[PDB]
Amino acid sequence: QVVNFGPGPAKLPHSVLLEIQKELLDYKGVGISVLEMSHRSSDFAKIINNTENLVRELLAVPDNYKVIFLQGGGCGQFSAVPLNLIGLKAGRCADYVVTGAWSAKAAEEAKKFGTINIVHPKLGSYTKIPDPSTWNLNPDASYVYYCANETVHGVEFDFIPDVKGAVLVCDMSSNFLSKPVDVSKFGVIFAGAQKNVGSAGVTVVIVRDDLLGFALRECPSVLEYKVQAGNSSLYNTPPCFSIYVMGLVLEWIKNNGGAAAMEKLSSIKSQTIYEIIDNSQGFYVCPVEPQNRSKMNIPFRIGNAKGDDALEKRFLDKALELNMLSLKGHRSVGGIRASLYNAVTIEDVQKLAAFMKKFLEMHQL
Amino acid sequence: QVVNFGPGPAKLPHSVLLEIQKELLDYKGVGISVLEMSHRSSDFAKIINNTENLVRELLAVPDNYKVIFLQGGGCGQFSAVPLNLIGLKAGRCADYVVTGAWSAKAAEEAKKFGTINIVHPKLGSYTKIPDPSTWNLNPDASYVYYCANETVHGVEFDFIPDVKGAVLVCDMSSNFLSKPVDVSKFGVIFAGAQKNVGSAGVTVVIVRDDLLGFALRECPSVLEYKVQAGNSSLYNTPPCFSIYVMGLVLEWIKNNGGAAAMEKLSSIKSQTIYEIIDNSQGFYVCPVEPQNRSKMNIPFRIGNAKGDDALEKRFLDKALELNMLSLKGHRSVGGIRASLYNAVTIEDVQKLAAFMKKFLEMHQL
């Protein structure tokens, strides 16, 4: 019955958790657990190769791109991206687009490795994507960074920005494989697996193969793109079980229609919630401009623009009573947040939709 | 019927794999998998705190020591230790003890962050520990680094070396919680979970609380001891499932007598194999001096000291027919290597003992 609206780590498909359970003591007959499996064995080589192929297949990754699986999460890439790329041009400058909490954290972290310049004026509220025409781009910048989907504020790019030919780095942790992606436009894409593509413990990084070999001296070898691509992500012991779980979710996505189907399913899901908000007559307020609304994370308030705390606690308390978990908004924003990642089914959103309507039908004045 | 002598990732207790399997879909009745569990939930807080408590209990870690769980494996700490500690003193020097392959790698990685002086002359063969009284120690070095147990060459410290008051850092990946440890004599202890206390994906680090706040600017935030100790290993998403698995293994060690019992069980196991080698009349050759022989990894050759390729293939071939996995020595050394970590039972070792005895009785000249 439990409906898991978790923001990350999130819900995994039930069929995947069933297979992990039944294979847990004897993976496909070899007689051991994946938790016991050597990363140098023929069996795990087949696991990590199939996981990489699915990333290339589902996203249509061109052959001039490496696909490596690192540790440290997305916040690790907040340091791995500058350590690997900020020396690409001698100036060691990088231009950053800050559309929410995770772009801000990444921009601040990069200040530890070079001079970071935010290309747009500071926004009073994380409610819109600054028009790319307003971007003040440095022609000598080593790269340009932006976050595809801001998990805390629900601001998402439905376009790949024009960065005047500079190398493009994109944080796609919260919408990875929720839609097709023109990988050819990017220099580095990274995404933590714990939102749309697996369990916590592994990060997928897609790097253009000529962007290796610019890493700083202080870059840890386990986080250097050049080192890990040359060892097929096996420079040291990889998160074997996380990569095994990730490949199963990737297989689940492929059986369900790939990135194209995920885009359609995430449209039906997000539209179901935005439809309640847009016709709520101010009872639900979503502050994001409609043309930048995320299809993965829908944060909103109850009552008014700043939110009525008394009504929102009653919403969450009744929501928890119905076994709908992790609907509380992020600590820094409060309010409500619904995360509708790939594993969240339509029936799961249909339960949330029915509850929001009955709650609105009981408290609108 | 599989006997798993893996070097890391290694064997987990059958009891632990059963509980992980039973609760994989509905952990302790909360309705979700740990793979789906949020790191901000009350449920995960119980897990990671109990995991931290068990490390403190089983090792008797003093209160002035932080216990943190990081990503990146042991090779991750090969960079995190210099980044966090090489700047204790302004010289940015560090003394390293190279007793095998893993201390050799850590010494080379540290050269990326400072001037590294290896305290002793090159050994020519990794068969002994250089005498600590002959160690050329730098009084202005920031710390002294050594690997307690060399997994590839089978050289293990049965003592804590006197570094004349320097901050002592130790790589205990391959013998962590195989014996009691006087933590007070160390500044930093770290260990990858996959060898003796769990599954790959998480690394435990024990740091004295006065050694924080010396990290270099280039240290990634997810690898900075101060940042991660201040957030109780929750600066970003931790390897939740790997920390969950480790807590069950630690609970298993506690139920089986703690570190004190692990030490004596490790003696029974290693003595069973080392005596077979010592009475083999040269049919089995272990080149490590007996006073430095590892109790965790026993590498040896068959036929003669340099190795009989024909006999070693049949040994590994017949061992595979009998479902004894991962007995092949490391790629860099060849020969045979038997890993006898905590979950490897005396019953497991007796199968290796009987087979080694029968192979000697059938090919000794």
Residue numbers in the entry:
A (entry chain C), B (entry chain D): 6 to 370
Please quote the paper that reports this structure.
Instead, in chains B and G, PMP was present in place of PLP. These results agree with the spectroscopic analysis indicating the co‐presence of PLP and PMP. In the active sites of the substrate‐free form, close to each PLP/PMP moiety, a sulfate ion is clearly visible in the electron density forming salt bridges with the side chains of His44* and Arg45*, and with His335. The presence of sulfate is probably due to its high concentration in the crystallization medium; nevertheless, it mimics the binding of the phosphate moiety of the natural substrate. In general, we suggest that this residue is flexible and might have an important role in locking the substrate during the reaction. We thus conclude that sulfate and phosphate itself can bring about most of the conformational changes needed for the open‐to‐closed transition.
Phosphoserine aminotransferase (PSAT) catalyzes the intermediate step, the pyridoxal 5′‐phosphate‐dependent transamination of 3‐phosphohydroxypyruvate and L‐glutamate to O‐phosphoserine (OPS) and α‐ketoglutarate. Human PSAT (EC 2.6.1.52) is a pyridoxal 5′‐phosphate (PLP)‐dependent enzyme whose coding gene is located on the long arm of chromosome 9. The 3D X‐ray crystal structure of PSAT was solved in the substrate‐free as well as in the OPS‐bound forms. Each monomer exhibits the well‐conserved α/β fold of fold‐type I PLP‐enzymes with two distinct domains.
